[PDB]
Amino acid sequence: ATGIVIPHWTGDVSAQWIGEGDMKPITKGNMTKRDVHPAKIATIFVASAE
Amino acid sequence: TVRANPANYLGTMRTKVATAIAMAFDNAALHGTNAPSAFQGYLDQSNKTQSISPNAYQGLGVSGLTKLVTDGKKWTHTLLDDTVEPVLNGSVDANGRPLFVESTYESLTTPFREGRILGRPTILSDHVAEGDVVGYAGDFSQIIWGQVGGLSFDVTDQATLNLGSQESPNFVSLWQHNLVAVRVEAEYGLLINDVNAFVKLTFDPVLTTYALDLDGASAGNFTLSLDGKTSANIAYNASTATVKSAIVAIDDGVSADDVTVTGSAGDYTITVPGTLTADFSGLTDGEGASISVVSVG
Amino acid sequence: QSISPNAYQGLGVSGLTKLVTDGKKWTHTLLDDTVEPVLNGSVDANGRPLFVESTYESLTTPFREGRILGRPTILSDHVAEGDVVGYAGDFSQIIWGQVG
Amino acid sequence: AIDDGVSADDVTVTGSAGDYTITVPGTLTADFSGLTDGEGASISVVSVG
Amino acid sequence: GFSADHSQIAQTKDTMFTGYLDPVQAKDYFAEAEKTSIVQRVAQKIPMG
Amino acid sequence: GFSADHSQIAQTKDTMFTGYLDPVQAKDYFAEAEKTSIVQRVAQKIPMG
Secondary structure, three states, X not given: OOOEEEEEEOOOOOOOOOOOXXXXXXOOOOEEEEXXXXXXXXXXXXXXXX | OOOOOHHHHHHHHHHHXXXXXXXXXXXXXXXXXXXXXXXXXXXXXXXEEEEOOOOHHHHHHHHHHHHHHOOOOOOOEEXXXXXXXXXXXXXXXXXXXXXXXXXXXXXXXXXXXXXXXXXXXXXXXXXXXXXXXXXXXXXHHHEEEEEOOOOEEEEEOOOEEEOOEOOEOOEEXXXXXXXXXXXXXXXXXXXXXXXXXXXEEEXXXXXXXXXXXXXXXXXXXXXXXXXXXXXOOEEOOOOHHHHHHHHHOOOOOOOOOOOEEEEEOXXXXXXXXXXXXXXXXXXXXXXXXXXXXXXXX | OOOOOOHHHHHHHHHHHHHHOOOOOOOEEEEEXXXXXXXXXXXXXXXXXXXXXXXXXXOOEEEEEEEEOOEEEEEEOOOOEOOEOEEEXXXXXXXXXXXX | OOOXXXXXXXXXXXXXXXXXXXXXXXXXXXXXXXXXXXXOOOOOOOOOO | OOOOOXXXXXXXXOHHHOOOOOOEEOXXXXXXXXXXXXXXXXXXXXXXX | OOOOOOOOOOOOOOHHHXXXXXXXXXXXXXXXXXXXXXXXXXXXXXXXX
């Protein structure tokens, strides 16, 4: 009933082929949060007690 | 941040670097974009190419396959970019009927799509294409690969990192800035036995350019051979116009409009439609000489 | 029998006629891999392929195999010589054996 | 020697000097326009095969 | 049918409940299955050291 | 990074390690398995002496 929140990934992470003594590269991710809230649907119906 | 681990960012990076490392294997094996010197050759080096856009069934099944079987080589798999599928479906007879009733399917466990084409296993994927090339077809048993143990993770809070390059440094001390770094490492080997065993697939026809090098003892003769048909003998010292004449003289008769030649005696660039090959057996050095495809661009 | 312009009219009519009119069966074929681009690209008068029939690998075998016009068919890398690129007939007429 | 797809032993030929018989794949054609005497000089299909 | 911050009725919409209504954090459902390399699916794997 | 035979850092690129780094020998992976004859696959085998 609180809803849900989802961390959608969006980052281009990248790796490199590297020589024996070569200097290894630095990388970083990326995200955007998305949230889902419930909603109600309802109806009423009616009759005589007879 | 490492205390908080928001959205499980640290555990998520450890899987998404593995995908980056997998992606970086294909681009090193197919296109060779940033391969290590230890990888011997890559599929873009092949001297066989084919067009598909007017009729993909003719392309893969006849004009393409002929270049393999007339050279004595098998066709066993194909890799296609997702952008090929509209052109594949768009292949029709001259009454508008589809040529591929044979068709391709999803996976519950992998992001690819997979199926059969003319009986061969076929993979469709979102990143096969680069530049002019949209896929590959050939004998994938000519390729072997291996991995040296598991994907490896180290963590440190004491190291000093260069955020620049070795030509223009920019250091940060992790310990003085209260930072933490994770270092991820893997190790693979690849060999392609015969790069000439595969056909590069493209939407529409192009000329192929070749570097021809006779570095070696400077007397004797060689034969060119274009689309499996072989020239007369060409001497070591032959001119560009001599070579152009010796190519067009082959009896499928590609025009002096199609062929072009540049360079000097003993060192040439050739541009032609179709597959070019050479045999140096008849030079005084039949081993130093070579021919290869120019990665033109 | 030539097969070059149209392999279906080659095997399935022109070829088969020469066997049934002589009172002999057709039960297998051997074909060179250089015939597969002639099996493919056999088409009608407006461009559609004639064979939907097709052939497959097997896990411990160098050959490729399938059914063509119902008959078991083998594709192989060395069966062609000279002008000849394949054989069709009643292979039950051949017996062989090995000693030791 | 036409080249341009034409190749050795695609072809064989018999008969006299002039009034030749020719055998080939595909469509044969003849241009007698430089053969100044032969205003009716002609190519005849004898048979397919 | 009422505004948020209506003078007479308590609603989950009301600004007074801000930060008591936090969603649960969940997995990324929209991301695809992780892309392995197509070459390793078709090429032969061998033992290596 | 660094040259082979760098003056300060030891690497297995260096000429001093020649012959200490020999590869493991392996099976031929590029040849297909040994080939049977096509006639023996379609013809009838009989007992013989």
